[model samples]
Target: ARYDSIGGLFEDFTQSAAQRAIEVRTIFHMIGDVSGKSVLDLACGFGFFGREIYRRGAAKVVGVDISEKMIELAREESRKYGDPLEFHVRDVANMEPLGQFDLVNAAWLFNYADSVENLRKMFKVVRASLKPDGKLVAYTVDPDFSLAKGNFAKYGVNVLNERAWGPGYRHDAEFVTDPPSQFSFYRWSRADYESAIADAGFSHFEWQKPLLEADDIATHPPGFWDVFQNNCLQTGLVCKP
Candidate 1:
């Protein structure tokens, strides 16, 4: 294996030179108004999207994640911001719906799931947690744009060693490795994602390839920004119930 451990993979995610704030803002743009509405953030890593929803005036924001460490981080960070955010350690796929909300969201959750079936399960749960006329939004990597066939691993660097930080570690493929920690990763194509969303009973799905500013492409070579902008991997999907 090229990577040393799971922590190494996550370190790469947190240390990403890309401007995450801009991506979060773009996602918020897709969802639109949140004032006085309730929101459920499934797999809400570190409360990025959850915090945004609360800041936009969400009446209540509930976050769920399978990782206790992620939930703790989200809770602590959210407290600093004084947002009405609550974090729970629950896997979105198996967690029962607690109540209905105006909106529900999940960002980058499917990237690591065992399969699209898990994502479909999560969407079903999110659907059950929404009131009639509610909206569900999610963000996942665009397979066509993010697959290894493209230079997908070029943007990643090894800040906290575990792996060599190179190709063969990334691509649209399944991996189960004993990084001394038993880690598994999966990737999906755009068609698989759309099919999962539709299977979950979501309708009126909107798709787009949002761009990143030159400034958003830090750490990477200047020309890399142009390539990234042309083949944006992140995509937003919103559906009305």
Candidate 2:
């Protein structure tokens, strides 16, 4: 995976001042109260979300990612905190049964599923990894919006295409960031996501957009919230099994 080679750079950008002031903080809010629960963090890069989950009183957190470098970094960074967090290098699409958990937090994992079959496979893994009443929360780039050239410059990202591409009606949008980082994301529409979730046996669903809090808005630049509010860079979903 492209992420394996750029662990340090990826970590720096993901945990940067801009991300903390907006995306990361918003995600934490959407997660709400995870007190005394077990959490499974899919694509748990650098153990960021896992650490937060532990801080919020999660009994234990099992983090899985396809990048070994990311898992290594996660372990290294988490050691100082002495938190009950475990890191594994595993692909989300065909994940083995790790354990049952109260909450499954998957951020940016679904975009890798470029086809309906792949998405279904990933969801099956999600279902198997959760307790009967456990909930799954995830966020990804909004598929509803088309990327305009230079639209992602504010975030130091560049989109390679003007329109969606690929199979199963999926949008194959490729992008690159600083340090020459690159990734291809398969953006699925709301209907596509709902179909996969239903096929995975999830009974309830809730969707959300990240909101720029008053404090966040006050701290950042004037047009800081423009990208998030207008482009809808990140969209979230909560599902029950």
Candidate 3:
């Protein structure tokens, strides 16, 4: 529902250096290769990474998002590719398995688990969607991320009321896009994520922080990304079922 009204602005938000440069590059590093793999992209938005994933050699890419308008744009944007990529407008919690996949890409899915029960449901969908050998490669706001501790404006992000509430409660952030956008999520703790993932049958849940590359440094001034890199705003939750 959050992105339904935003439409293409979400695409522009990703164009920001923090998103396009750091976020994408870092997550893709963790995602590794998609060649010949069937991938399920959760909360896929306008299918940006889904399209990129296919372009990078994924055999099949199925994108799922709760917002119909977002899926509409995803579908419209993908038409020119004229390939088999598919987009579905369905809640990740409720969607029945389309088929097992070699990988599942959940950019911001677990953080939306508004309740402990909802977290379990989301993981169940994830585990159900994956082949046993497959892994879930995804990112979320770093467990220790805090606006009070670091400046996010440099990254074109603003968490309107960050720390207004404690972990296990709903919180949100605003992106400084064309029209700007906001999305709410439960401020789940690392323990919350670990427990829910284990309860859902996942045996390994490793936390990974974003890594800066020489290319990232070469593109920016010596210290442009130093602070954000020092205080990574997102972390990875790579796991296996």
lDDT of each: 0.64, 0.75, 0.80
The regions of model 3 sitting more than 4 angstroms off are: 163-169
Deviation (Å) of 41 in candidate 3: 0.5
TM-score of each: 0.75, 0.88, 0.91
Q: Which tens-of-lDDT digit does each residue in 20-74 have in candidate 3?
A: 5667877798899999999999989888777889999999999999999999998
Model 1, residue 81: distance off in Å is 4.2
Give lDDT tens digits, candidate 1, residues 142-176.
Answer: 65553323443334421121221122123332122
lDDT comparison, 2 vs 3, better candidate: 3
Off by over 4 Å in 2: 17-20, 167-178
**Native-referenced Cα lDDT, model 3:** 0.80
Residue 144 local lDDT, model 2: 66
Per TM-score, the best of the predicted structures is: 3
Q: Rank candidates, TM-score, best first.
A: 3, 2, 1
Q: In candidate 2, which residue pairs get closer than 3 Å at backbone N, Cα or C atoms, i.e. clash?
A: none
TM-score of 3: 0.91
Models sorted by lDDT, best on top: 3, 2, 1
